[PDB]
PDB file of C-alpha atoms and ligand atoms in Angstrom:
ATOM      1  CA  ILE A   6     -23.646  -2.568 -71.397  1.00 33.21           C
ATOM      2  CA  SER A   7     -24.509   0.969 -72.059  1.00 33.06           C
ATOM      3  CA  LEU A   8     -23.977   3.473 -69.501  1.00 32.06           C
ATOM      4  CA  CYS A   9     -26.143   7.048 -69.388  1.00 28.42           C
ATOM      5  CA  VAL A  10     -24.408  10.209 -70.811  1.00 25.83           C
ATOM      6  CA  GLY A  11     -27.368  12.035 -68.488  1.00 23.31           C
ATOM      7  CA  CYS A  12     -26.643  10.112 -65.394  1.00 24.48           C
ATOM      8  CA  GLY A  13     -23.022   7.467 -65.269  1.00 23.89           C
ATOM      9  CA  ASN A  14     -24.751   4.754 -64.985  1.00 26.25           C
ATOM     10  CA  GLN A  15     -26.899   1.445 -66.471  1.00 30.98           C
ATOM     11  CA  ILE A  16     -29.157   1.874 -68.445  1.00 31.97           C
ATOM     12  CA  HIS A  17     -31.872  -1.131 -67.720  1.00 31.20           C
ATOM     13  CA  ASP A  18     -35.219   0.011 -69.155  1.00 32.54           C
ATOM     14  CA  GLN A  19     -36.657  -1.400 -71.946  1.00 31.40           C
ATOM     15  CA  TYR A  20     -36.161   1.417 -74.269  1.00 32.25           C
ATOM     16  CA  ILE A  21     -32.222   3.176 -74.510  1.00 34.35           C
ATOM     17  CA  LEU A  22     -33.181   7.309 -76.549  1.00 33.71           C
ATOM     18  CA  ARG A  23     -30.506   7.976 -77.956  1.00 34.47           C
ATOM     19  CA  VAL A  24     -29.081  11.535 -79.579  1.00 36.16           C
ATOM     20  CA  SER A  25     -26.544  11.330 -82.883  1.00 37.68           C
ATOM     21  CA  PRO A  26     -24.541  10.480 -82.751  1.00 36.20           C
ATOM     22  CA  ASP A  27     -23.850   7.159 -79.718  1.00 36.86           C
ATOM     23  CA  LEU A  28     -24.642   9.721 -77.658  1.00 39.19           C
ATOM     24  CA  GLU A  29     -27.328   7.593 -75.295  1.00 36.31           C
ATOM     25  CA  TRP A  30     -29.813   8.590 -71.765  1.00 36.18           C
ATOM     26  CA  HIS A  31     -32.263   7.100 -69.792  1.00 37.50           C
ATOM     27  CA  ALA A  32     -34.958   8.797 -70.781  1.00 40.03           C
ATOM     28  CA  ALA A  33     -35.668  10.748 -68.040  1.00 41.06           C
ATOM     29  CA  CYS A  34     -31.972  11.600 -67.813  1.00 36.35           C
ATOM     30  CA  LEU A  35     -32.340  13.964 -71.743  1.00 35.33           C
ATOM     31  CA  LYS A  36     -33.526  17.009 -69.535  1.00 33.62           C
ATOM     32  CA  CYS A  37     -33.818  20.091 -71.707  1.00 33.24           C
ATOM     33  CA  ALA A  38     -30.946  22.654 -70.011  1.00 35.27           C
ATOM     34  CA  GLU A  39     -32.479  24.781 -69.587  1.00 32.89           C
ATOM     35  CA  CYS A  40     -36.691  24.368 -69.005  1.00 35.01           C
ATOM     36  CA  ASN A  41     -35.803  20.932 -67.763  1.00 35.74           C
ATOM     37  CA  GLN A  42     -38.547  19.450 -69.747  1.00 37.30           C
ATOM     38  CA  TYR A  43     -37.849  15.501 -70.834  1.00 36.04           C
ATOM     39  CA  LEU A  44     -36.553  15.973 -74.935  1.00 35.88           C
ATOM     40  CA  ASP A  45     -37.698  11.818 -75.758  1.00 33.32           C
ATOM     41  CA  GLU A  46     -41.139  14.219 -76.466  1.00 34.58           C
ATOM     42  CA  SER A  47     -40.005  15.698 -80.173  1.00 35.40           C
ATOM     43  CA  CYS A  48     -37.864  14.401 -82.617  1.00 35.53           C
ATOM     44  CA  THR A  49     -34.847  15.843 -82.097  1.00 35.71           C
ATOM     45  CA  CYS A  50     -32.580  18.406 -80.271  1.00 35.24           C
ATOM     46  CA  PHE A  51     -29.771  20.714 -80.150  1.00 37.63           C
ATOM     47  CA  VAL A  52     -26.414  20.190 -78.500  1.00 37.51           C
ATOM     48  CA  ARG A  53     -24.053  22.895 -77.827  1.00 36.96           C
ATOM     49  CA  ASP A  54     -21.312  22.986 -75.565  1.00 35.23           C
ATOM     50  CA  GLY A  55     -21.963  19.794 -74.036  1.00 38.46           C
ATOM     51  CA  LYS A  56     -25.158  20.868 -72.887  1.00 38.07           C
ATOM     52  CA  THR A  57     -28.382  19.567 -74.367  1.00 36.51           C
ATOM     53  CA  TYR A  58     -31.058  22.225 -75.711  1.00 37.63           C
ATOM     54  CA  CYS A  59     -34.999  22.183 -76.158  1.00 34.77           C
ATOM     55  CA  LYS A  60     -35.741  24.683 -79.577  1.00 35.56           C
ATOM     56  CA  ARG A  61     -37.298  27.345 -77.891  1.00 35.93           C
ATOM     57  CA  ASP A  62     -34.686  27.931 -75.550  1.00 33.76           C
ATOM     58  CA  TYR A  63     -31.556  26.814 -78.272  1.00 32.65           C
ATOM     59  CA  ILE A  64     -33.285  29.657 -80.231  1.00 32.46           C
ATOM     60  CA  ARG A  65     -33.305  31.638 -77.543  1.00 31.77           C
ATOM     61  CA  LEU A  66     -30.278  31.327 -76.716  1.00 33.41           C
ATOM     62  CA  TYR A  67     -27.791  30.610 -79.415  1.00 35.12           C
ATOM     63  CA  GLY A  68     -31.202  30.575 -83.032  1.00 37.91           C
ATOM     64  CA  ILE A  69     -31.132  33.091 -85.556  1.00 37.85           C
ATOM     65  CA  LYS A  70     -33.273  35.836 -83.648  1.00 39.25           C
ATOM     66  CA  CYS A  71     -34.072  39.099 -84.358  1.00 38.36           C
ATOM     67  CA  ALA A  72     -32.203  42.046 -83.771  1.00 38.88           C
ATOM     68  CA  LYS A  73     -35.235  43.969 -81.948  1.00 39.45           C
ATOM     69  CA  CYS A  74     -37.968  42.005 -80.434  1.00 43.42           C
ATOM     70  CA  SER A  75     -35.871  39.459 -79.667  1.00 44.02           C
ATOM     71  CA  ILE A  76     -37.742  36.979 -80.851  1.00 41.45           C
ATOM     72  CA  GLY A  77     -36.605  34.372 -83.897  1.00 41.55           C
ATOM     73  CA  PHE A  78     -37.714  33.277 -86.996  1.00 39.93           C
ATOM     74  CA  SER A  79     -39.652  30.527 -88.353  1.00 37.29           C
ATOM     75  CA  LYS A  80     -37.815  29.019 -91.564  1.00 37.37           C
ATOM     76  CA  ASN A  81     -40.406  30.271 -94.025  1.00 39.85           C
ATOM     77  CA  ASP A  82     -39.787  33.708 -92.908  1.00 43.52           C
ATOM     78  CA  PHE A  83     -38.723  36.824 -94.331  1.00 42.54           C
ATOM     79  CA  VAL A  84     -36.385  38.984 -92.588  1.00 43.99           C
ATOM     80  CA  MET A  85     -34.953  42.412 -93.371  1.00 44.23           C
ATOM     81  CA  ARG A  86     -30.392  42.614 -92.540  1.00 41.63           C
ATOM     82  CA  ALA A  87     -28.389  45.313 -91.369  1.00 43.53           C
ATOM     83  CA  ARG A  88     -24.344  45.173 -91.788  1.00 46.49           C
ATOM     84  CA  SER A  89     -24.850  41.647 -89.008  1.00 49.38           C
ATOM     85  CA  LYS A  90     -28.172  41.984 -87.396  1.00 48.91           C
ATOM     86  CA  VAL A  91     -31.390  39.759 -89.343  1.00 54.34           C
ATOM     87  CA  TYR A  92     -34.692  42.039 -88.776  1.00 55.93           C
ATOM     88  CA  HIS A  93     -38.640  40.729 -88.516  1.00 56.12           C
ATOM     89  CA  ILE A  94     -40.311  42.532 -91.817  1.00 58.89           C
ATOM     90  CA  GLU A  95     -42.768  43.959 -88.866  1.00 58.75           C
ATOM     91  CA  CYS A  96     -39.451  45.028 -86.810  1.00 58.56           C
ATOM     92  CA  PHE A  97     -37.763  47.069 -89.611  1.00 53.98           C
ATOM     93  CA  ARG A  98     -38.667  50.581 -87.952  1.00 54.77           C
ATOM     94  CA  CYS A  99     -36.461  53.937 -87.441  1.00 51.86           C
ATOM     95  CA  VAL A 100     -35.842  53.611 -83.083  1.00 53.97           C
ATOM     96  CA  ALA A 101     -36.968  57.336 -83.746  1.00 55.46           C
ATOM     97  CA  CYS A 102     -39.941  58.023 -85.216  1.00 55.51           C
ATOM     98  CA  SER A 103     -41.042  54.754 -85.113  1.00 55.50           C
ATOM     99  CA  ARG A 104     -41.605  53.670 -88.864  1.00 55.06           C
ATOM    100  CA  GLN A 105     -41.167  51.547 -91.069  1.00 57.20           C
ATOM    101  CA  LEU A 106     -38.094  51.521 -94.064  1.00 55.43           C
ATOM    102  CA  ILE A 107     -37.485  50.202 -97.652  1.00 55.62           C
ATOM    103  CA  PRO A 108     -35.915  49.177-100.280  1.00 56.55           C
ATOM    104  CA  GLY A 109     -33.666  52.092-101.010  1.00 55.99           C
ATOM    105  CA  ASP A 110     -33.550  54.390 -97.786  1.00 57.92           C
ATOM    106  CA  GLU A 111     -30.552  55.586 -96.711  1.00 59.29           C
ATOM    107  CA  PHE A 112     -30.033  54.263 -92.906  1.00 56.65           C
ATOM    108  CA  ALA A 113     -27.878  53.469 -90.037  1.00 52.68           C
ATOM    109  CA  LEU A 114     -27.598  50.827 -87.153  1.00 53.98           C
ATOM    110  CA  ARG A 115     -26.596  52.280 -83.962  1.00 53.70           C
ATOM    111  CA  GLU A 116     -26.516  51.322 -81.232  1.00 52.03           C
ATOM    112  CA  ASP A 117     -29.263  52.843 -79.546  1.00 48.26           C
ATOM    113  CA  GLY A 118     -30.875  50.815 -82.863  1.00 46.26           C
ATOM    114  CA  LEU A 119     -32.082  51.672 -86.574  1.00 44.63           C
ATOM    115  CA  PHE A 120     -32.270  55.166 -87.160  1.00 43.45           C
ATOM    116  CA  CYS A 121     -33.891  56.815 -90.557  1.00 38.89           C
ATOM    117  CA  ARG A 122     -31.178  59.242 -92.052  1.00 36.05           C
ATOM    118  CA  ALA A 123     -33.569  62.169 -90.634  1.00 38.13           C
ATOM    119  CA  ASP A 124     -32.994  61.318 -86.634  1.00 36.52           C
ATOM    120  CA  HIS A 125     -29.383  60.225 -87.605  1.00 36.96           C
ATOM    121  CA  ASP A 126     -29.334  63.991 -88.859  1.00 35.45           C
ATOM    122  CA  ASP A 143     -22.424  55.693 -91.259  1.00 34.77           C
ATOM    123  CA  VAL A 144     -25.289  55.897 -93.540  1.00 36.17           C
ATOM    124  CA  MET A 145     -26.249  52.135 -95.454  1.00 36.83           C
ATOM    125  CA  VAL A 146     -28.724  51.876 -98.193  1.00 36.74           C
ATOM    126  CA  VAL A 147     -31.479  49.797 -96.627  1.00 37.80           C
ATOM    127  CA  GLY A 148     -31.792  46.464 -98.566  1.00 35.07           C
ATOM    128  CA  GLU A 149     -34.303  44.357-100.022  1.00 34.61           C
ATOM    129  CA  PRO A 150     -36.519  41.542 -97.563  1.00 32.20           C
ATOM    130  CA  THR A 151     -35.143  38.406 -98.302  1.00 29.51           C
ATOM    131  CA  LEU A 152     -36.180  34.477 -97.083  1.00 26.98           C
ATOM    132  CA  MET A 153     -34.573  32.514 -94.605  1.00 22.64           C
ATOM    133  CA  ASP A 159     -29.354  22.366 -88.404  1.00 24.56           C
ATOM    134  CA  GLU A 160     -25.641  22.842 -87.453  1.00 21.03           C
ATOM    135  CA  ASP A 161     -25.828  21.384 -84.057  1.00 19.43           C
ATOM    136  CA  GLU A 162     -28.944  20.461 -84.118  1.00 18.34           C
ATOM    137  CA  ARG A 163     -29.750  15.845 -83.830  1.00 14.68           C
ATOM    138  CA  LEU A 164     -32.113  13.484 -84.142  1.00 15.15           C
ATOM    139  CA  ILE A 165     -33.759  11.349 -81.513  1.00 18.20           C
ATOM    140  CA  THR A 166     -34.011   7.604 -81.430  1.00 16.20           C
ATOM    141  CA  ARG A 167     -35.794   5.674 -79.679  1.00 17.74           C
ATOM    142  CA  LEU A 168     -33.823   2.372 -79.400  1.00 21.00           C
ATOM    143  CA  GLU A 169     -34.701  -1.331 -77.712  1.00 24.00           C
ATOM    144  CA  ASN A 170     -32.754  -2.238 -74.680  1.00 23.49           C
TER     145      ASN A 170
HETATM  146 ZN1  LIG B 201     -29.395   8.063 -66.246  1.00 24.81          ZN
HETATM  147 ZN1  LIG B 202     -35.933  24.475 -73.256  1.00 24.00          ZN
HETATM  148 ZN1  LIG B 203     -38.367  41.373 -84.463  1.00 24.39          ZN
HETATM  149 ZN1  LIG B 204     -36.448  57.583 -87.883  1.00 20.52          ZN
END
């Protein structure tokens, strides 16, 4: 037998959807925990804290995302760092003078945001921009 993890009842459909490892689902019960959408549409889905998510919602909630615009990154995107906070090369602006920061600029991360060594007045030296799966899991459609 196989008990659908979403609802607990037996799966009598022609195919059983398995989130790796060992999570068997009714196709209708495999929903994004936030947007409610069937995750059958995709090869993969994300699984944290016992909830199952689609990428958009995953990244938007748990993924690495940008400290300014609050939007996730593309696998080949190049990001500027601040101690703990990654940033879109386009969004690495001083929030006060609203202008770009470059490798070799004195700068500082304040609660309000990034500030250049002029609008600040701890201080740092802006660094070189850089390019770039733990909770991600494979969806397989097993025949019943
Ligand atoms: Zn079910
Ligand atoms: Zn979603
Ligand atoms: Zn950004
Ligand atoms: Zn500034």
